Amino acid sequence: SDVFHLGLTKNDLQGAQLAIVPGDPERVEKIAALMDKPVKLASHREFTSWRAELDGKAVIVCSTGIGGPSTSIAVEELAQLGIRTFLRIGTTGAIQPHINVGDVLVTTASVRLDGASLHFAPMEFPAVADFACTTALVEAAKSIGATTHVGVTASSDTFYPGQERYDTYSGRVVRRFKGSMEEWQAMGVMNYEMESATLLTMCASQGLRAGMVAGVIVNRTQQEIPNAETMKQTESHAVKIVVEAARRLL
Template sequence: MSQAAGRQYHIGLGEADIEGARYALLPGDPGRVPQLARGVGARAVELGQHREHCSWLAYIAEQPVLVCSTGLGAPSTAVAVEELANIGVTHFIRVGTSGSIQPHIDYSDLVISKAAVRLEGTSSHYAPLAYPAVASFELTASLVASARALDIPHHVGITASSDTFWPGQERYDNHSGYVLRRFQGSMAEWRQLKVTNFEMEAAALFTVCATFGLSAACVCGVIAKRVESEEVRPEAYGLAEQRWNAVLAKTLGERLSRKPEK
């Protein structure tokens, strides 16, 4: 049996495991998978864990939705997308945390990415740097419509996806306290260019999915305000989680309840 038809090497899942799910929610942290699955679905079932990829099925509008962690950063995200596509997933939504770099974006607000700056290296293995990292319009518009309908604070913008948590996001609280010259002043430059936030996966997700003809979107909760400090505030996570769960449940509930087109 070919790998495409059977159990995938890294995620440890096969086509039969996901029960025909076409949508996948992709948190980075394996520890967040159970809460996310339970938070968006009427019921949720654990599938298992292989490496950094913890997987559950959530049932929304009586349809299965896969929740699978990607691990931290772009390389493992690309691996997860490739293998999930092999077993039939066509729509991918990254769900994670982020640091805002615009003063009007507050703690626990949601940022829905319409595109991403390719500060990571993984996407260049799929397309040249001139190729844009752009989210799927229809899927992203559904998330925005849900956030508006629920009156949840949100922002639609361009995300900067870095390969590193510290230097690439111009954090001076790293081990050495030093940031390479090419990153010094970079946060102010991205702010001037109206970039909304830093994270580490969206650019790879958007690029990989676009080159494969798949749909991708990204929603992140703000747990750091970089215009104020480099501090991450874990207490902002709970409200952000409530907000993205509500947006995702509404979005997927509506999309999965639609009658299939003839």
């Protein structure tokens, strides 16, 4: 209404200045439920929004969708709506053998293998998280007793060739990404996802604070497959971390 995609007015946010941003609209209710007086605001495409209260202050939970283009829309309009702090929650696979399912990852900066970030800063600019957000996430994780890894994430415009997956229709990856996974592994990159390069670059270049946490639900480099219930329990822990991080940032 006040914005062009989310279907939200300013007053709907009730002065909220922090937002928690999952990718999947299915996860918006369950995260808002952790907090006081969860109310459903709107639901348009993959932008589902709920509002809640935390220590007396209004908070927003809004889905971003998949990929940088979708995310940029969500972040841009929420920034217009007055949101100044963004905490990304996700579930992810790991790319390091010593990172286990059920572990938690806090991202300090991202490898920019995407397109939308370049609209906000040149490639030379770092896709870096805010120090306060990162600190809050690291502290909330440790308070919960989570096994935590803090470092670089690779952020890709594709799920398949940019993550060097070969079990595809064509079975081929373009030269740019051939051997790329081994390279990132050697450089200490923790995981692959698809949204953070846009999130972190647009926030760092525009005076906004952002951070990201993710629960490890799978590991491509490990032979053992993840349990059914442990994936659901890792997801709830990650949610717990992000809410408890948000409490310190209000």
